[PDB]
């Protein structure tokens, strides 16, 4: 009962297996070189606009989420 959730928000555009493996991603890695974001787009049929901005804008939301504090 407890148990609860929330969001479902934002402006973005994918697939389901497309965030599951966007995901999955920024998981090992915060950012990803030219060499590989540009292959990726092309493994989950994104745009390198769309590999570039969901992560970019992804970390920025993680740190708020990670302890890391610096």
Same mark, same amino acid.
């Given at each position: 009962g $407890?148990?609860?959730? $929330? &969001?479902?928000?934002?402006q973005?555009?994918?697939?389901?297996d497309q965030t599951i493996e966007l995901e999955k991603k920024?998981?090992?890695?915060?950012?990803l070189s030219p060499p590989e974001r540009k292959r990726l787009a092309k493994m989950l049929q994104? $745009?390198?606009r769309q590999v570039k901005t969901w992560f970019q804008n992804?970390?920025?939301?993680?740190r708020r989420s &990670?302890?890391?504090? &610096?």
């Open positions: $407890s148990s609860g959730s $929330s &969001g479902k928000g934002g973005v555009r994918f697939s389901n920024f998981e090992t890695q915060k950012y994104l $745009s390198e992804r970390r920025a939301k993680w &990670g302890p890391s504090s &610096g």
